[PDB]
Amino acid sequence: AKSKNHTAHNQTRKAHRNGIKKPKTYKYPSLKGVDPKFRRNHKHALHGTAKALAAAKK
């Protein structure tokens, strides 16, 4: 006995029962994947402006 092999019937109906939702934008994305040479500097950059505001607000 042979089967029925493939279809996509009812697959688009199933999909919309629960939305098809977007993945939520965030203020501040991850620096995973970003140029290492740039990050290396940006770490040291904020340490300075925090210490500048810490010494300012003392």
């Binding site: 199933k14 029962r17 939305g19 098809i20 977007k22 993945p23 994947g33 970003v34 140029d35």
Partner: protein, 159 residues
């Protein structure tokens, strides 16, 4: 059997246009991309390095990284009951700025000027775009323009 290679079905897609083969023009390389910019993807066929997969042809994302000869674009791709968030590393031939965002930016300067001028003028603004409203009345003259009477024509073969 079946065949699902990385560039299958791309006979006419990565083709090079008619009378536009050969070297890419220098204004392609002299354009400066920054983190945040919107860009449309369109794969040049001559440059084999840094190429996108056939899916991202015609998609438009945001930049997130910039490095020696490439940019990081970030696209949304749909799969099932969901959208995943996908990170590309394309060379700069296969990319160009979205002119829809550049249209928007210029309107922001227009609207800020209207509000700045409205305060100096004296109250009221109304700065939203209204869609095409239904048209008003008019008196169409017959002065040197009398109506031309028409009727349906009979069938002739001419073959």
């Amino acid at each position: 059997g079946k065949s699902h290679g990385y560039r299958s079905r791309t006979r006419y897609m990565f083709q090079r246009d008619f009378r536009k083969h050969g070297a890419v023009h220098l204004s392609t390389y002299l354009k400066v991309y920054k983190v945040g910019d919107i860009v449309d993807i369109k794969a040049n066929g001559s440059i084999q390095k840094g190429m996108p997969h056939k899916f991202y042809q015609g998609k438009t994302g945001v930049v997130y990284n910039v490095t020696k000869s490439s940019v990081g674009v970030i696209i949304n791709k749909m799969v099932g009951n969901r959208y995943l968030e996908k990170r590309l590393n394309l060379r700069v031939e296969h990319i160009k700025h979205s002119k829809c965002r550049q249209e928007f930016l210029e309107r922001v300067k227009a609207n800020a000027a209207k509000r700045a001028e409205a305060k100096a003028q004296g109250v009221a603004v109304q700065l939203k775009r209204q869609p095409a409203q239904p048209r008003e009345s008019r008196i169409v003259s017959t002065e040197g323009n009398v109506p031309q009477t028409l009727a349906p024509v009979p069938y002739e073969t001419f073959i």
